[PDB]
Design a protein around this ligand. Structure first.
Ligand SMILES: *[C@@H]1O[C@H](CO)[C@@H](O[C@@H]2O[C@H](CO)[C@@H](O[C@@H]3O[C@H](CO)[C@@H](O)[C@H](O)[C@@H]3O)[C@H](O)[C@H]2NC(C)=O)[C@H](O)[C@H]1NC(C)=O
Ligand SMILES: *[C@@H]1O[C@H](CO[C@@H]2O[C@@H](C)[C@@H](O)[C@@H](O)[C@@H]2O)[C@@H](O)[C@H](O)[C@H]1NC(C)=O
Ligand SMILES: [Cl-]
Ligand SMILES: [Cl-]
Length: 256
């Protein structure tokens, strides 16, 4: 694959989670190859596996080939068969039902300032137990829902939630030698105001309580750690996932 990640994953014993939150620091990462590159930060809420993988996805993405510019834009995605034949971005296919247009799916977002003003995308996803519909709220305002009727394995709840950053490297370096940025383009050790974060790492358990997992409850993923990485910063108030990085320069020079 030509995707790279700095992602954490929360796995539950069964598909009974009832929702999750994500409050995602907004940035405008730079793409080295805008013809096909993209960079994003999102939540993935899933059940099943293989061709029965169902996902619920919301975040921000810089993807010029899809959106027509390099601004961070709010996006959604879903699939009901592990990305084989079903699912699509935003409202480009029948799927998500938007009930409130106060916020536009695809809207450009305000990017944070290095060492300055920070902006957050707060999204809350909540399963309605009477229907199986999954409702989306942004900054506390309803947008709409993913209907249970498009799904097969996530209608009763989810078994996995993932948060963090992703880049797609269209130049074929495997995401290992591209200066396409993830998050703010800065490594997590730079911390608040300089490296991007996800907070409100919360799930809704089977008993309906809101639970903020501790850091040891997460499986981390960073397959190109010299290029993009994550670091937990567990404060007293809440757990922070700091994530991203500048990418790696094409500095290799090997010869026999
Ligand atoms: C983090 O996730 C939790 C869990 O989904 C969010 O709390 C939930 O927020 C929704 C809508 O903001 C609450 O819905 C309201 O509930 C009352 C009944 O008490 C109902 O009459 C209202 O019409 C409305 O639908 C819901 O109660 C609440 N759930 C729980 C378990 O607390 C929370 O908003 C998320 N926070 C962030 C920052 O994303
Ligand atoms: C799903 O499983 C629940 C209990 O599962 C275990 O306990 C919770 C607290 C987590 O630690 C989880 O990872 C474990 O597998 C049951 O109480 C619940 O009824 C189950 N739901 C269904 C629909 O069967
Ligand atoms: Cl899978
Ligand atoms: Cl680091």
């Amino acid at each position: 694959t030509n995707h790279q990640y700095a992602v954490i994953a929360y796995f539950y014993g069964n598909a009974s989670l009832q929702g999750a939150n994500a409050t995602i620091n907004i940035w405008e990462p730079n793409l080295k190859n805008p013809n096909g590159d993209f960079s994003l930060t999102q939540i993935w809420i899933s059940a099943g596996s293989g061709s029965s993988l169902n996902t619920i996805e919301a975040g921000w993405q810089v993807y010029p080939g899809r959106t027509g510019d390099s601004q961070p834009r709010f996006f959604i995605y879903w699939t009901a068969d592990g990305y084989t034949s079903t699912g699509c971005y935003d409202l480009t296919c029948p799927g998500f039902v938007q009930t409130n247009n106060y916020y536009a799916i695809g809207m450009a977002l305000q990017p944070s300032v290095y060492g300055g003003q920070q902006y957050e995308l707060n999204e809350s996803i909540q399963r309605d137990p009477a229907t199986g519909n999954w409702w989306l709220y942004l900054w506390g305002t309803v947008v709409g829902y993913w209907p249970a009727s498009i799904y097969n394995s996530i209608t009763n709840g989810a078994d996995t939630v993932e948060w963090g950053g992703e880049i797609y490297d269209s130049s074929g370096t495997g995401g290992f030698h591209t200066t396409t940025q993830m998050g703010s383009g800065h490594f997590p050790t730079e911390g608040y105001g300089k490296a991007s974060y996800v907070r409100d790492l919360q799930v809704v358990d089977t008993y309906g309580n809101v639970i903020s997992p501790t850091a040891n409850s997460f499986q981390g993923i960073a397959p190109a750690p010299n290029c993009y990485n994550y670091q937990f910063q567990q404060g007293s108030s809440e757990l922070y996932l700091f994530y991203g990085g500048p990418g790696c320069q094409a500095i290799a020079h090997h010869h026999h």
